[PDB]
Design an enzyme around this catalytic site. Sequence first.
Site, PDB file in Angstrom:
ATOM      1  N   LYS E 226      12.588  84.152  53.184  1.00 44.11           N
ATOM      2  CA  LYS E 226      11.669  85.793  53.046  1.00 44.11           C
ATOM      3  C   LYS E 226      10.107  85.934  53.256  1.00 44.11           C
ATOM      4  O   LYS E 226       9.812  86.849  53.763  1.00 44.11           O
ATOM      5  CB  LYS E 226      12.115  85.892  51.294  1.00 44.11           C
ATOM      6  CG  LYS E 226      11.757  87.244  50.684  1.00 44.11           C
ATOM      7  CD  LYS E 226      11.921  87.000  49.654  1.00 44.11           C
ATOM      8  CE  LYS E 226      10.773  88.570  49.496  1.00 44.11           C
ATOM      9  NZ  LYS E 226      11.423  88.975  47.219  1.00 44.11           N
ATOM     10  N   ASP E 227       9.739  84.433  53.554  1.00 44.78           N
ATOM     11  CA  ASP E 227       8.555  84.513  53.568  1.00 44.78           C
ATOM     12  C   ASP E 227       8.318  84.599  55.782  1.00 44.78           C
ATOM     13  O   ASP E 227       7.585  84.972  56.383  1.00 44.78           O
ATOM     14  CB  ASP E 227       8.268  82.880  53.488  1.00 44.78           C
ATOM     15  CG  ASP E 227       7.382  83.487  52.391  1.00 44.78           C
ATOM     16  OD1 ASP E 227       7.364  84.415  51.755  1.00 44.78           O
ATOM     17  OD2 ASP E 227       6.913  81.985  51.292  1.00 44.78           O
TER      18      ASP E 227
HETATM   19  C1  LIG Z   1       7.628  79.868  55.535  1.00 43.53           C
HETATM   20  C2  LIG Z   1       6.654  79.111  54.776  1.00 43.53           C
HETATM   21  C3  LIG Z   1       6.763  77.783  55.342  1.00 43.53           C
HETATM   22  C4  LIG Z   1       5.987  77.278  53.627  1.00 43.53           C
HETATM   23  C5  LIG Z   1       6.274  75.975  54.356  1.00 43.53           C
HETATM   24  C6  LIG Z   1       5.192  77.639  53.085  1.00 43.53           C
HETATM   25  N1  LIG Z   1       4.905  77.526  52.012  1.00 43.53           N
HETATM   26  C7  LIG Z   1       4.287  78.188  50.863  1.00 43.53           C
HETATM   27  S1  LIG Z   1       3.168  77.802  49.346  1.00 43.53           S
HETATM   28  C8  LIG Z   1       3.625  76.820  48.210  1.00 43.53           C
HETATM   29  C9  LIG Z   1       3.448  76.777  46.577  1.00 43.53           C
HETATM   30  C10 LIG Z   1       2.972  75.333  46.208  1.00 43.53           C
HETATM   31  C11 LIG Z   1       2.459  74.039  48.228  1.00 43.53           C
HETATM   32  C12 LIG Z   1       2.306  75.247  45.617  1.00 43.53           C
HETATM   33  C13 LIG Z   1       2.435  76.168  44.429  1.00 43.53           C
HETATM   34  C14 LIG Z   1       2.750  77.479  44.492  1.00 43.53           C
HETATM   35  C15 LIG Z   1       3.535  77.765  46.593  1.00 43.53           C
HETATM   36  N2  LIG Z   1       4.483  79.205  46.000  1.00 43.53           N
HETATM   37  N3  LIG Z   1       5.366  79.467  44.912  1.00 43.53           N
HETATM   38  N4  LIG Z   1       5.806  80.352  45.024  1.00 43.53           N
HETATM   39  N5  LIG Z   1       5.217  81.261  46.140  1.00 43.53           N
HETATM   40  C16 LIG Z   1       5.433  82.400  46.594  1.00 43.53           C
HETATM   41  C17 LIG Z   1       4.124  80.276  46.557  1.00 43.53           C
HETATM   42  O1  LIG Z   1       3.678  80.136  48.214  1.00 43.53           O
HETATM   43  S2  LIG Z   1       4.672  79.859  51.421  1.00 43.53           S
HETATM   44  C18 LIG Z   1       5.648  79.734  52.987  1.00 43.53           C
HETATM   45  C19 LIG Z   1       6.134  80.420  53.675  1.00 43.53           C
END
Ligand SMILES: Cc1cc(C)c2nc(SCc3c(C)cccc3-n3nnn(C)c3=O)sc2c1
Lengths: 48, 241, 71, 64, 378
Positions: E226-227
Site C-alpha cells: 500500500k506504500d
Molecule cells: C514501501 C515502504 C518500505 C518501508 C521499509 C517502509 N517503512 C516504513 S516505517 C515503519 C514503522 C516503524 C519502523 C516503526 C513504527 C511504526 C512504523 N509504521 N507503522 N505503521 N506505519 C504506517 C508505519 O510506518 S513505511 C515504509 C514503506
Amino acid sequence: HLVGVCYTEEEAKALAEEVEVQDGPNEDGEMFMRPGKLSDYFPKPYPN
Amino acid sequence: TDLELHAPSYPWSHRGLLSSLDHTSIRRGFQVYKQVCSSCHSMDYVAYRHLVGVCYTEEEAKALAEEVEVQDGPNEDGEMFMRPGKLSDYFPKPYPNPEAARAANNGALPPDLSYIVRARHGGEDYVFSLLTGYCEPPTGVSLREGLYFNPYFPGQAIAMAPPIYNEVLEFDDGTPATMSQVAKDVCTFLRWASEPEHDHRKRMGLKMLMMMGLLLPLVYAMKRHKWSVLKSRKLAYRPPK
Amino acid sequence: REFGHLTRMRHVITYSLSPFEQRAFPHYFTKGIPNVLRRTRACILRVAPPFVVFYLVYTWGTQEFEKSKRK
Amino acid sequence: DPLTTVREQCEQIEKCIKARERLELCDQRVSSRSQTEEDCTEELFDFLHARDHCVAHKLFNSLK
Amino acid sequence: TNIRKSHPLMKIINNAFIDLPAPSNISSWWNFGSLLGICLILQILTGLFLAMHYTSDTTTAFSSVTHICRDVNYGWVIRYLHANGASMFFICLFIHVGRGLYYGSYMFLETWNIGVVLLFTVMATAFMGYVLPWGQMSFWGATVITNLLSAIPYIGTDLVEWIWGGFSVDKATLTRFFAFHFILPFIITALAAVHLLFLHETGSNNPTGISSDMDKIPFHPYYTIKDILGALFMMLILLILVLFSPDLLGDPDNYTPANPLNTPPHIKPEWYFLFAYAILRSIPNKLGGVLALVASILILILMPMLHTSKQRSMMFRPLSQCLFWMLVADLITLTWIGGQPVEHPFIIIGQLASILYFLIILVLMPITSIIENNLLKW
Ligand SMILES: Cc1cc(C)c2nc(SCc3c(C)cccc3-n3nnn(C)c3=O)sc2c1
Ligand code: HEC
Ligand code: HEM
Ligand code: HEM
Ligand SMILES: Cc1cc(C)c2nc(SCc3c(C)cccc3-n3nnn(C)c3=O)sc2c1
C-alpha cells in the site's frame, strides 16, 4: 605580502608605484595603463 | 494614480500540452533579432552553436559569424588580434563599453533579452502587446524629450522608440513583412531563447504517461489480491450460556 | 510488543477465504456509487461551510481593491 | 496591414462604442480649464481592454 | 533455523518492517510519513548533483545556474526536479501535521516533540537554498529577514554581520548560506530516525482513537504494497509538474539578476512561506513581529496539555470538526493575504485572521471539548 615582514605600508605603496601596469577596458578609452595599486602581483618577465 | 493593463491571450501554436514550436518561425525570428535589435540589446547566454538543428544547417550557421570579426586576447608579437568569429562565440554585445550605455538611450539601459519572456508577468503575450500597442498620448498626460506613450508598460512612459513599423526587413523565403508578421517571429524566437528544452520536455512527458499507464493499474491489482483475505472475512461471538 | 503477547481474548471465531478462490471485482459500480453517496452526505455539513466563508471574503476583498482606483 | 484590417472591424462593437462614448464625453471636458490635473489615461484603458480582447481571437488566422 | 530471527542485521529489519504489528483499519492519511521520507532522499541526491556545478560568489552565482540549464547534460531536468520537489515536500508535511492534530496523535509525547523540532529545521533549510540563485527575490528576501533579525535586543546586530561574511553581499557572503544549506538536511535525517524509534514503543494510532491490540496484522505484505502504490502515484504528479509546467509555482521576477540599484514591483515569497509573512506584516513593531512568527510554530507544543476531551480523536466529536476546518480555511486566507500588496482591504483582513489563528487553538478548542463532555455526561 611584504607589509610587516620587511617593509611598512608606506615604503610598499611607493615601491609598487615604480612600475606602471596594464589595466582593463573602459568606455571613452582602451585597456589603459596605471601605476601599481598595492594589490598587484609581481610583474611577469616574458610576453608568453 | 495610473494603473495596470494586462495583455490578452493569443492562440500561439505551442500553447498545447504536446504542441511543439514552429521551427520555420524561429528561423525568421533570428533575422529580426540580428538586424533590428542587437543595436540596442544583448543576448549574453546564446551562442551560434545553439542554432544547429533548431533552425540552421551547421554550414549555413558557420556562414553566419563570418559576418562579424571580434577581438581576442594577446598573443606573442601581437597585442589585440582580430579574427572572424567561430562557432563557440556568443552573440555580440550592442553598445560597446557598458551600462553608461544609457547616453544613447536618455539614461535607460536597454535590458538583456535572453530571459525576457521568462522574466515578465505574461510571457510572449506581453512582448506582443507592447510592440504593436504603441499609440498617442491621451488628453493631457506628461512627456519628456525622449520618451513615448505605451499603455502596456507600467508607468505608460517608455524610453524606446517604436522599432518596427512596416516593410522593415526582407525575409529570404518570400513571406510578406507587415507589422504583425514580424513581432510574431521575435516572440517565437525569444521563447526558444528562454526555454530551449521546450520540445524535448514535452516528448519525455508522453513517454512517461504511456509507461505509467502500464505500471500503475497493475500494482493496484497486486494490492487488491492481498487485501481480499481481510475484506471478505466473518466474525462470530459465542459466549457460554 | 510481538504477536503472541498483546492482549487477552476469549470466544471469538474468524472465517476467511483464499485469495485464489475469489473474484477481483464482485461489485464495483453497483455498491461503489451508493456507498460514497452515504459517506459524502455524512461529511458535507461539517467541511463545506468554512470554505463558503473564504469564498465570500475573496469576492468582497478583490472588489474593494478595484474600485479604489478609477472612480 | 492585416492588423489594421482586424482592429477597425472590431472597433464597432457594443462594448467599444459604449467605451468611446464616455471617452470623448470626457476628452472635451479636460481642455477647457487650463489649470487641471485630470487625465483620461483611465478612459483609454477601458476601450483598449474591450478592443484587444477581440483582436486576439481573430488575428492569428491572417498571419504566416 | 529461521535466519530472519537469528541473524544480527536481519533481526533489526524484521522487527521494524516485516513482523511489526499494525492496526488493520489504517487509512491513506497514514501514507504521508513514508512519502516525506521519499521526498527527503530525492532532495539529497538531486542537490548533490547541483553542488558540483554551482559557484557561491555574488558575481557568478546567477550565471552558474543558467549554465547548468543550458550547457550541462540533463541539467535542466535535475534543476527543476529540485525546485518542484521542495514544493512536494511542503505539501506532504502540512498533510502530515494536520493528520496528527485531527486524530489526536500528539498524545505520543516524545514523538510529537521531535516532530516540532523537525518542522523548524526544514523551514530554515528551504530559506537558505532560495538565496543561492541570487536573482531579485533572493536579494530582497535575504534583506527582509536580516533587518528583522537586527531587532533582537542585545545580540541582534552581532548576528547580522556574521552571516554575510562580515559585510554586505560579496564573494564570501554566500559561502555561509551555502554551508548551512548543505549540512542541515543531514541532521534532519538523524532526527527522523530518532522520531521512529520512539514510535516503535507504542505502535500507531488509528482513526477511531481506540486501542487495537486485539486486531493487529503484520506490516508485510499489507502495508508494504500500500506504500509502494502511494509512492508511484506521487512520482506521477511530480513529473506532471516538471515536464508540463515547470514554472507554474515559481515567480518570474527571480529570472532577473540581483540589483541593489534596480527595483522589483512586489515582494512575494514562495507559497509555503506566505502564511508566516502575513502574520509579520500585521504587527506594527519589529520585536513583536519576530515573536509572533516564532510563536505560530511553537504553539504546536502546547497541544498535549490543552486537551480537555474524554476521547482521543475527532471522529466522534462533531463540534470539534467544525473548528478544525475553520482553522484550515484560516490558513488559506493568510496565504492569499500574504501575496497581496499592503492597502486598505488587505490590511484589516490580515490582522483579523492573525487573531483567529490564536483564538481557535488556545481558547475556542478547549472550551468546546468541555461542552461535548457535558452533553455525553462525561
Ligand atoms: C514501501 C515502504 C518500505 C518501508 C521499509 C517502509 N517503512 C516504513 S516505517 C515503519 C514503522 C516503524 C519502523 C516503526 C513504527 C511504526 C512504523 N509504521 N507503522 N505503521 N506505519 C504506517 C508505519 O510506518 S513505511 C515504509 C514503506
Ligand atoms: C535603438 C533602441 C532600441 C531598439 C532598436 C529596440 N529597443 Fe527595446 N528598449 C529600448 C530601451 C531604451 C529600453 C528600456 C526602456 C525603458 O526603460 O523605458 C527598451 C526595452 C525593451 C523591453 C523591456 C520592456 C520592459 O518592460 O522592461 C522589451 C521586451 C523590448 N525592449 C523589446 C524590443 C524588441 C523585441 C526589439 C527589436 C526586434 C527592440 N526592443 C528594439 C530601446 C530599443
Ligand atoms: C522530515 C519530517 C518527517 C518524517 C520523515 C516523518 C516520518 C514519519 C513516519 C514514517 C511515520 C510513521 C507512518 C505514518 O503514520 O505516517 C510518522 C509518524 C508520526 N509523525 Fe512524522 N515525520 C516527519 C515529521 C513530523 C512532524 C513535523 C510531526 C508533527 C509536528 C510529526 C509527527 C508524527 C506523529 C505524531 C506520528 C505518529 C502518528 C500516528 O501513528 O497516528 N512528524 N512520521
Ligand atoms: C530538505 C532538503 C532540501 C530542500 C527543501 C532544498 C530546497 C532548495 C530550494 C528551494 C532551492 C532554490 C532552488 C530554486 O528555486 O531555484 C535550493 C537550491 C539549491 N540547493 Fe537545495 N534543498 C534541499 C537539500 C539540498 C542538499 C542536501 C543540497 C546539497 C548537497 C542542496 C543543494 C542546493 C544547491 C547547490 C542549490 C543551488 C541553486 C539552484 O540550484 O537553484 N539542496 N534548494
Ligand atoms: C522558521 C522560519 C525561518 C525563516 C528564515 C523563515 N523565512 C520566511 S519568509 C522569507 C522570504 C521573504 C521575506 C521574501 C522573499 C522570499 C523569501 N523566501 N526565502 N526563502 N524562500 C523559500 C522564500 O520564499 S518564513 C520563515 C520561517
